[PDB]
């Protein structure tokens with residue numbers, strides 16, 4: 433069946449106040465079927481609040497829209513985000529002592545462009561502590577990662593969360 437609607441939404445900030453439901457829709461329909469598209473407005477003045485949201489039919493369409501950033505909508509670069517604590521770094525726990533950089537890179541590179549991999553070691557002994565941090569060049573990688581129920585790396589079922 434269909435992915436949960438919450439995972440098919442993009443919250444678009446930074447809109448031009450002249451963007452309408454119709455112009456936001458015409459823009460974002462380039463990357464998929466939109467089941468919903470709303471510009472948020474003041475209830476009395478009808479003046480735009482400068483943000484809105486679009487709902488795609490599938491998660492792959494959300495991915496396509498995010499991969500097509502930067503989006504210039506009605507002359508202004510906007511800020512799309514999935515369903516916000518916006519960070520580029522993750523904690524990866526449960527990797528034990530046998531997990532190496534290449535295991536983490538080969539897996540996580542498919543979520544985004546990696547800038548730093550830090551495998552944590554004991555300050556006194558140098559032994560691996562069984563966790564790591566991965567820093568990406570952009571927050572959408574992290575957002576995709578943390579909504580997955582499971583992460584399997586080097587045969588380990590890992591705990592992954594946003595870091596700082």
Ligand SMILES: COCC(=O)NCc1nc2ccccc2[nH]1
Pocket residue numbers: 443444472483484485513514515516
């Ligand atoms: C990114 O996190 C999801 C979320 O709901 N953030 C606040 C939020 N609430 C909204 C209601 C209508 C349109 C846009 C909205 N944005």
